[PDB]
Write an enzyme that holds these catalytic residues in place. Structure first.
Site, PDB file in Angstrom:
ATOM      1  N   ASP B  60       0.838  -1.197   0.000  1.00  0.00           N
ATOM      2  CA  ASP B  60       0.000   0.000   0.000  1.00  0.00           C
ATOM      3  C   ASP B  60       0.874   1.250   0.000  1.00  0.00           C
ATOM      4  O   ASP B  60       0.720   2.132   0.846  1.00  0.00           O
ATOM      5  CB  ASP B  60      -0.921   0.012   1.225  1.00  0.00           C
ATOM      6  N   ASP B  66       2.815  15.279   2.244  1.00  0.00           N
ATOM      7  CA  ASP B  66       3.319  15.787   3.514  1.00  0.00           C
ATOM      8  C   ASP B  66       4.146  14.750   4.271  1.00  0.00           C
ATOM      9  O   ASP B  66       5.166  15.083   4.874  1.00  0.00           O
ATOM     10  CB  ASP B  66       2.172  16.322   4.392  1.00  0.00           C
ATOM     11  N   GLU B  89       7.068  19.838  12.267  1.00  0.00           N
ATOM     12  CA  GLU B  89       5.673  20.205  12.448  1.00  0.00           C
ATOM     13  C   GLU B  89       4.808  18.938  12.452  1.00  0.00           C
ATOM     14  O   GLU B  89       3.722  18.926  13.029  1.00  0.00           O
ATOM     15  CB  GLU B  89       5.244  21.135  11.306  1.00  0.00           C
ATOM     16  N   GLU B  90       5.314  17.877  11.823  1.00  0.00           N
ATOM     17  CA  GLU B  90       4.604  16.596  11.712  1.00  0.00           C
ATOM     18  C   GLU B  90       4.849  15.597  12.843  1.00  0.00           C
ATOM     19  O   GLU B  90       4.173  14.569  12.910  1.00  0.00           O
ATOM     20  CB  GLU B  90       4.980  15.908  10.398  1.00  0.00           C
ATOM     21  N   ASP B 110       9.234  22.828   8.978  1.00  0.00           N
ATOM     22  CA  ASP B 110       7.852  22.591   8.612  1.00  0.00           C
ATOM     23  C   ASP B 110       8.033  22.006   7.209  1.00  0.00           C
ATOM     24  O   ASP B 110       8.170  22.749   6.238  1.00  0.00           O
ATOM     25  CB  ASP B 110       7.136  23.936   8.569  1.00  0.00           C
ATOM     26  N   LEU B 112       6.103  20.640   4.838  1.00  0.00           N
ATOM     27  CA  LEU B 112       5.243  21.057   3.739  1.00  0.00           C
ATOM     28  C   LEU B 112       4.161  22.001   4.262  1.00  0.00           C
ATOM     29  O   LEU B 112       3.033  21.595   4.537  1.00  0.00           O
ATOM     30  CB  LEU B 112       4.625  19.827   3.057  1.00  0.00           C
ATOM     31  N   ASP B 113       4.532  23.269   4.396  1.00  0.00           N
ATOM     32  CA  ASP B 113       3.638  24.304   4.886  1.00  0.00           C
ATOM     33  C   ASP B 113       2.545  24.635   3.872  1.00  0.00           C
ATOM     34  O   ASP B 113       2.800  24.730   2.667  1.00  0.00           O
ATOM     35  CB  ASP B 113       4.450  25.556   5.219  1.00  0.00           C
ATOM     36  N   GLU B 272       7.745  28.099  12.001  1.00  0.00           N
ATOM     37  CA  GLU B 272       6.940  28.950  11.136  1.00  0.00           C
ATOM     38  C   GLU B 272       7.274  30.409  11.447  1.00  0.00           C
ATOM     39  O   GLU B 272       7.861  31.105  10.617  1.00  0.00           O
ATOM     40  CB  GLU B 272       5.441  28.681  11.337  1.00  0.00           C
TER      41      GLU B 272
HETATM   42  O1  LIG Z   1      -6.647  28.369   7.142  1.00  0.00           O
HETATM   43  P1  LIG Z   1      -6.043  29.454   8.012  1.00  0.00           P
HETATM   44  O2  LIG Z   1      -6.651  29.564   9.396  1.00  0.00           O
HETATM   45  O3  LIG Z   1      -5.988  30.792   7.283  1.00  0.00           O
HETATM   46  O4  LIG Z   1      -4.493  29.015   8.260  1.00  0.00           O
HETATM   47  C1  LIG Z   1      -3.522  29.212   7.217  1.00  0.00           C
HETATM   48  C2  LIG Z   1      -2.147  29.237   7.842  1.00  0.00           C
HETATM   49  O5  LIG Z   1      -1.922  27.988   8.562  1.00  0.00           O
HETATM   50  C3  LIG Z   1      -0.939  27.232   7.889  1.00  0.00           C
HETATM   51  C4  LIG Z   1      -0.231  26.356   8.910  1.00  0.00           C
HETATM   52  O6  LIG Z   1       0.738  25.519   8.297  1.00  0.00           O
HETATM   53  O7  LIG Z   1      -1.559  26.461   6.831  1.00  0.00           O
HETATM   54  P2  LIG Z   1      -2.103  24.958   7.182  1.00  0.00           P
HETATM   55  O8  LIG Z   1      -2.701  24.982   8.577  1.00  0.00           O
HETATM   56  O9  LIG Z   1      -3.145  24.682   6.111  1.00  0.00           O
HETATM   57  O10 LIG Z   1      -0.903  24.037   7.065  1.00  0.00           O
HETATM   58  C5  LIG Z   1      -0.036  28.281   7.234  1.00  0.00           C
HETATM   59  O11 LIG Z   1       0.656  27.718   6.136  1.00  0.00           O
HETATM   60  C6  LIG Z   1      -1.042  29.343   6.795  1.00  0.00           C
HETATM   61  O12 LIG Z   1      -0.456  30.647   6.786  1.00  0.00           O
HETATM   62 ZN   LIG Z   2       3.071  25.404   8.273  1.00  0.00          ZN
END
Ligand SMILES: O=P(O)(O)OC[C@H]1O[C@@](CO)(OP(=O)(O)O)[C@@H](O)[C@@H]1O
Ligand SMILES: [Zn+2]
Ligand SMILES: O=P(O)(O)OC[C@H]1O[C@@](CO)(OP(=O)(O)O)[C@@H](O)[C@@H]1O
Ligand SMILES: O=P(O)(O)OC[C@H]1O[C@@](CO)(OP(=O)(O)O)[C@@H](O)[C@@H]1O
Ligand SMILES: O=P(O)(O)OC[C@H]1O[C@@](CO)(OP(=O)(O)O)[C@@H](O)[C@@H]1O
Ligand SMILES: [Zn+2]
Ligand SMILES: [Zn+2]
Ligand SMILES: [Zn+2]
Lengths: 329, 329, 329, 329
Positions: B60, B66, B89-90, B110, B112-113, B272
């Site tokens: 699988d 991510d 972050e993970e 982080d 994959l932000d 972040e």
């Molecule tokens: O959906 P909202 O509350 O705007 O959060 C977006 C913010 O949170 C983050 C945190 O990583 O995105 P996400 O939670 O989707 O990963 C930032 O990349 C982004 O600036």
């Molecule tokens: Zn992030």
């Protein structure tokens, strides 16, 4: 059974018993999109920065991406021998194709949508709308002045984290992911349908001081829901192609209404609004100016602008109800 | 001449007469980012859709981007023999590197932000911060609990229309574009400095009902300039890396204040806020929670969250003055 | 006017007023060739060497290139819905395509020609021959037992310094260079013709102790020309596809006659000899066993072997004259 | 763990506690090779065939691969600030690096070996040898006139079915495969050793009429083994880099002796013979002119030529014994 864009376009052409021009036209668009994508991802930029010195380039050749994308679409489309009139967001006048390479289709396109996002590397893309030559007289811009409702095909290529081509035709919208390793678009989502209602609203709120009363009320509801439900999330990439694609796959609503500097909206009807309205309607969504269906507008200028609201049916219908309300008087 | 990231780091390493451990760490980071970019761009996706039949798969193996990004960074960083503690972050717990591959650097990242933007193909990226272990005790998460001001290097890789790596160090911020044709990051912007004042504000206004009075007053001012100047344009991609990069290259301001669901802000300090604050300050910008400098916060939790406001000095300062004003009433 | 393989195949199909199966078949071959090329160039090999650790692959999946190439051709060819019988150099029995995906064409191919050259990274390639289903009864191996003269299309893809596809059909041979940046085959040489006489001979002289008298005399003439002209140059890459391609573009002669271990030659008639003989004859060259035209041989086994001499007409004719000479008695 | 070329060189540099100049030189070489590989594979060739129209071109930018390869190596090596003298197979005079970018290393290289195989797409490559300047006088060509035994590093990049870089240094020979997906050379073969005896001989027998008696006797022996064993197979790609690489990985012998047109052999000592001889000896192989060790020859001309025999010890020794035998009559 893996399906590529080439195989998909080919089969759709056979089932339609077409001569083959449409198939050649779509094949050409596919090739143009891959060439633009590779350029957008900056392949070969090292050469512009002198990795091999400066023995070849003996003069200006540093074309901007938007200009290069325009040249690729125009050139590749012409070599398809399936078009007669081309309308580009980057050209003042319509382009009339030489008799030798003249075909029956009219193509309206936006080579690299999201100009303001080009330099900051935010998602950008290409939008296209295809019409079948109607009249029988010599081809002119008039052939491009057809209501979006007459579109035979429309879609866009999004150069985002990955490159994707979304193609909409009479029987539905299909999404193809570009696999850059083999230069092949792979069908990954067939007969796409937008959700009835989303939870995201997309609009440049910077023009708030100039929004009409209906837009103002709608946005207020998204933030302060009268029924106390959860507020909508906000997203505005700044590139129509990116915001609309997210709207298609996540649901919700996208808006670009009229304002002071843009009394009739900013987005252009032929290569931004209509193509997206067609994709939306084929996906079960709505696209309105807030007073009429975008696809029913009869164009009077190839660079005509129009206000546009599109997305999940229930979200767009709510805004239409507000417009009706503020018109009841 | 042309400068690659590899030569830039190598050179910088020699300038500060380092043992070369930091150089190897940055080299490994470069490799991890290129590998992530390739996956993000969907190279080889055709295999997942059965181009070679269903004989290759045996279990699988369907790793989400991510998870893959996290495995790449962790594995590549460990293989650098330059790290002792890793915070992702993970991962709920800090990762302590085995004694064999142990180095003196602490890396917070982080992988994959922009999680919410992964499926809609909007720009996403990788964020990282590097600290030097300041202790003789066995490596533990405590080694990662340093204020951002202690960072020796920080940056991010943006997988947008093109892939760019931004690296900040004591001497400044430099931008490198990835030329995917040869797999090399090319220096395209030296000693970057942000504009003193911008014209774009970036925030998720969907939480308007929950903003503190200062944020609310500031946003109103961006839409209704008291000096009757042109209102700021709005942009909110939804991926911190993308919105912050645009902030750096175009100027303006980025905000993610506290709200009901996130009383201490949503963004995480270690991987972040701190990295982006360091990049901002090295570029002549500001980064504040509204009440204090982000880089001065001494964390007590590796996943600690914090409100953040960053961008052009004049813009951030204007918001800080609003905060200071309310606290003076 | 740039011409891609897709556009070339499409147009040839229209001018021939075909249903479209041939076009779909060739499109599929094109896709398969690109997928094999990317694998051959080792894209993604870093993953096999643990760049992302070992979290995905939970079992055997390290397919050899020759096995992978075979799976790609078979799978991609089947998904074209244009074939009924497939003969591969890697499969003992012919492959009968399911009724659901059954088409009218018979395809004989050599997935990765030049097995001995795979590990040393020397040029290798794919060879293919296409026949139209003759009989009306159920498809079987018999449908593949047709003289090469009945070929409707044949060619090969060479994975050399660059990847090139050579396609031969009723009216000529055309060469397409693969541009890996956009995954597109570009027509670079149309209606190719081999030179009447070359100056290179290609053969494995290691079997000298077992060559028939004619081959022996011919080789002696190449080295010690009786008329004292300049001796021919020698080249033997070891991969038929590479040596034959060089013969096509540079001229000269290629040989693989019978020997002790290979009494009827080593190369196989259906997917090595016939395809190459067809390309050669369409290019104005000759292909003989030394006694008869290769394309006139009536196959009796799908893995039948045959001696073969091909190349410039004047060079092959000289060898035929020597064979006639040694037969006059 | 996974080892990239970048980490390998960096590590080796630290082991010998070097200033890092050699490391930067190898890094630059890596970049030049990747760039050459991309061009060789024809990435972007579609632009040359007018995909974007004829608006990009402004002069006569049609650089042949060999000229481009030479410009890449020269420009990239100079940008390393680690070299003082450069000798290229393409330049009649040694290139003296400007004082500003001057380093202590002397590099001899063959930018694109296998000239005759460029147009037929057969494997080609880049060969290089690195010496340390052993003098205090101003850099001149004399600094490149050192016997191969003085080399500190040597190797080649083979652009075959896949691109591989082979690097030999005092400690041994290592092979790195280029993963084009991420632009990284991956160590796939550590401390390589050639087989003591092979089964393949490689030579252009077209010069048979001009071979000395020793070469002639040896070849006859390969075809007619006196011990009646199986004859050696023959292979001659025509590109030294390709034939030598196969010799290294499969064992056997490679020969290019003197002839009428090349009384002192054809291959050049500084950038063809020496680098390959060094790689061979570091791998446990032999390299002789037939009368002396290639690495012991003190050159007097940067473009000096020399006969060469290299490969598995037992095979080379067998030929040397034939030479010694004739000289003893
Ligand atoms: O959906 P909202 O509350 O705007 O959060 C977006 C913010 O949170 C983050 C945190 O990583 O995105 P996400 O939670 O989707 O990963 C930032 O990349 C982004 O600036
Ligand atoms: Zn992030
Ligand atoms: O800056 P604002 O007014 O939001 O305009 C953005 C809109 O305009 C367009 C028009 O193409 O971008 P842009 O003007 O930067 O090219 C759309 O892509 C996008 O939806
Ligand atoms: O080793 P020798 O006997 O020269 O055989 C080489 C010939 O056999 C073939 C057969 O495919 O290679 P191989 O057996 O290594 O697969 C041809 O590609 C090539 O022309
Ligand atoms: O054509 P012949 O005389 O065999 O010469 C081939 C040899 O010469 C070289 C010299 O570089 O090729 P070429 O002259 O075609 O560049 C070597 O690569 C190769 O081993
Ligand atoms: Zn646009
Ligand atoms: Zn074969
Ligand atoms: Zn050479």
């Amino acid at each position: 059974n893996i399906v590529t864009l080439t195989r998909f376009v080919m089969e759709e052409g056979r089932k339609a018993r077409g001569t083959g021009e449409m198939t050649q036209l779509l094949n050409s668009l596919c090739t143009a999109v891959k060439a633009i994508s590779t350029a957008v991802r900056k392949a070969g930029i090292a050469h512009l920065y002198g990795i091999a010195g400066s023995t070849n380039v003996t003069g200006d050749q540093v074309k901007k991406l938007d200009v290069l994308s325009n040249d690729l679409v125009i050139n590749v489309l012409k070599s398809s021998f399936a078009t007669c009139v081309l309308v580009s967001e980057e050209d003042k006048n319509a382009i009339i194709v030489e008799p030798e390479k003249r075909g029956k289709y009219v193509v309206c396109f936006d080579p690299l949508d999201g100009s303001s996002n080009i330099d900051c590397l935010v998602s950008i893309g290409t939008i296209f709308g295809i019409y079948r030559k109607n009249s029988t007289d010599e081809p002119s811009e008039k052939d491009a002045l057809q209501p979006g409702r007459n579109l035979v095909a429309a879609g866009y290529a999004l150069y985002g984290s990955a490159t994707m081509l979304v193609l909409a035709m009479v029987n539905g919208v299909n999404c193809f992911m570009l696999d850059p390793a083999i230069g092949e678009f792979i069908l990954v989502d067939r007969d796409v349908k937008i959700k009835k209602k989303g939870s995201i609203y997309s609009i440049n709120e910077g023009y708030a001081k100039e929004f009409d009363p209906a837009i103002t009320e709608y946005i207020q509801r998204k933030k302060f829901p009268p029924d106390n439900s959860a507020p909508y999330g906000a997203r505005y990439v700044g590139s129509m192609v990116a915001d609309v694609h997210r709207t298609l796959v996540y649901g919700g609503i996208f808006m670009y209404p009229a304002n002071k500097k843009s009394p009739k909206g900013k987005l252009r009807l032929l290569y931004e609004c209509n193509p997206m309205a067609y994709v939306m309607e084929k996906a079960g969504g709505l696209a309105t100016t807030g007073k009429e269906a975008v696809l029913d507008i009869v164009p009077t200028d190839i660079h005509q602008r129009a206000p546009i609201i599109l997305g999940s049916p229930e979200d767009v219908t709510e805004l239409l109800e507000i417009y009706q309300k503020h018109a009841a008087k």
